[PDB]
Design an enzyme around this catalytic site. Structure first.
Site, PDB file in Angstrom:
ATOM      1  N   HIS A  40       0.733  -1.130   0.060  1.00 46.98           N
ATOM      2  CA  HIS A  40      -0.136   0.018  -0.085  1.00 46.98           C
ATOM      3  C   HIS A  40       0.913   1.122  -0.036  1.00 46.98           C
ATOM      4  O   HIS A  40       0.153   2.295  -0.084  1.00 46.98           O
ATOM      5  CB  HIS A  40      -0.925  -0.003   1.309  1.00 46.98           C
ATOM      6  CG  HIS A  40      -0.589   0.430   2.491  1.00 46.98           C
ATOM      7  ND1 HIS A  40       0.042  -0.398   3.346  1.00 46.98           N
ATOM      8  CD2 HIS A  40      -0.390   1.614   2.912  1.00 46.98           C
ATOM      9  CE1 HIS A  40       0.462   0.140   4.316  1.00 46.98           C
ATOM     10  NE2 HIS A  40       0.230   1.501   4.332  1.00 46.98           N
ATOM     11  N   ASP A  84      -0.131  -7.383   1.764  1.00 44.06           N
ATOM     12  CA  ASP A  84       0.218  -5.984   1.841  1.00 44.06           C
ATOM     13  C   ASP A  84       2.047  -6.235   1.995  1.00 44.06           C
ATOM     14  O   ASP A  84       2.568  -5.826   2.946  1.00 44.06           O
ATOM     15  CB  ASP A  84      -0.306  -5.090   2.935  1.00 44.06           C
ATOM     16  CG  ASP A  84       0.064  -3.805   2.829  1.00 44.06           C
ATOM     17  OD1 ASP A  84       0.738  -3.294   1.726  1.00 44.06           O
ATOM     18  OD2 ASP A  84      -0.128  -2.897   3.984  1.00 44.06           O
ATOM     19  N   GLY A 174       2.555   6.537   8.780  1.00 44.95           N
ATOM     20  CA  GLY A 174       3.664   7.103   8.509  1.00 44.95           C
ATOM     21  C   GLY A 174       4.765   6.056   8.959  1.00 44.95           C
ATOM     22  O   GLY A 174       5.870   6.191   8.646  1.00 44.95           O
ATOM     23  N   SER A 176       3.917   2.921   8.137  1.00 46.38           N
ATOM     24  CA  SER A 176       3.471   1.755   7.170  1.00 46.38           C
ATOM     25  C   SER A 176       4.531   1.490   6.296  1.00 46.38           C
ATOM     26  O   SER A 176       5.440   2.074   5.883  1.00 46.38           O
ATOM     27  CB  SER A 176       2.416   2.529   6.211  1.00 46.38           C
ATOM     28  OG  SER A 176       1.182   2.604   6.877  1.00 46.38           O
ATOM     29  N   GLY A 177       4.749   0.063   6.015  1.00 47.78           N
ATOM     30  CA  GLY A 177       5.990  -0.490   5.421  1.00 47.78           C
ATOM     31  C   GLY A 177       7.104  -0.620   6.357  1.00 47.78           C
ATOM     32  O   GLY A 177       8.015  -1.321   5.905  1.00 47.78           O
TER      33      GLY A 177
END
Ligand SMILES: [Ca+2]
Length: 221
Positions: A40, A84, A174, A176-177
């Protein structure tokens, strides 16, 4: 990262910042040429910033490298944020040193109860925590029962919940990942959750251990 603490500088040498004019997602260096992030967080082109602690101040430990390939998992599905996970290839190999070091992929899956660490430059929802400086948070993996109970029928085989059902500590927008490291290896990727640090709404992470075949396969291609 909400309810966490400022990481000791460079204690998470695999942590990278994805930048497209500003920081928008985290990522994890898994070798000199590849970074693992969330699907995402996809963008056709991204700047990978390694060796960072304070993303707003130049420290001299940084390495800014543009991506040369950004590959979302083929079974990624945005509607339910399933699978994801994403691979980013660096246009040039990162120089491994005191500030930049890869994190190893999981030999096997981590069971509920395992205490891990998640980090990032995301929202801290606190006037005390400075998101500009890499934040760290220790979170335990939750049982499937508690995970599914929090989000009925929304947990797939590619997800696991980690955190505190009581609220107050969790990853956030923020982050994320970014990485979730358990005993030194990458078990998770910051993916989603309803709000941040909200009671009954624990963080959901992409379950890295089931993507080994795809990860190694792709990085060799
Ligand atoms: Ca910096």
């Amino acid at each position: 990262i909400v309810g966490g603490y400022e990481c000791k500088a460079y204690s998470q040498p695999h942590q990278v910042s994805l930048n497209s004019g500003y920081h928008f997602c985290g990522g994890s260096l898994v070798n000199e040429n590849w970074v693992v992030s969330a699907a995402h967080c996809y963008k056709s082109r991204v700047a990978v910033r390694l060796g960072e602690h304070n993303i707003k101040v130049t420290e001299g430990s940084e390495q800014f490298i543009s991506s040369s390939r950004v590959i979302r998992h083929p079974n990624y599905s945005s509607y339910n944020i399933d699978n994801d996970i994403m691979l980013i290839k660096l246009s040039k190999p990162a120089t491994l040193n005191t500030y930049v070091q890869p994190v190893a992929l999981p030999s096997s899956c981590a069971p509920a109860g395992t205490m891990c660490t998640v980090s990032g430059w995301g929202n801290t929802m606190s006037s005390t925590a400075d998101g500009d400086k890499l934040q760290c948070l220790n979170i335990p993996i939750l049982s499937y029962s508690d995970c599914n109970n929090s989000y009925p029928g929304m947990i797939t085989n590619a997800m696991f919940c980690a955190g505190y059902l009581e609220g107050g500590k969790d990853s956030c927008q923020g982050d994320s990942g970014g990485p979730v490291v358990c005993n030194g290896e990458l078990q998770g990727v910051v993916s989603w959750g309803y709000g941040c640090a909200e009671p009954g709404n624990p963080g959901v992470y992409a379950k890295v251990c089931i993507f080994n075949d795809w990860l190694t396969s792709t990085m060799a291609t």
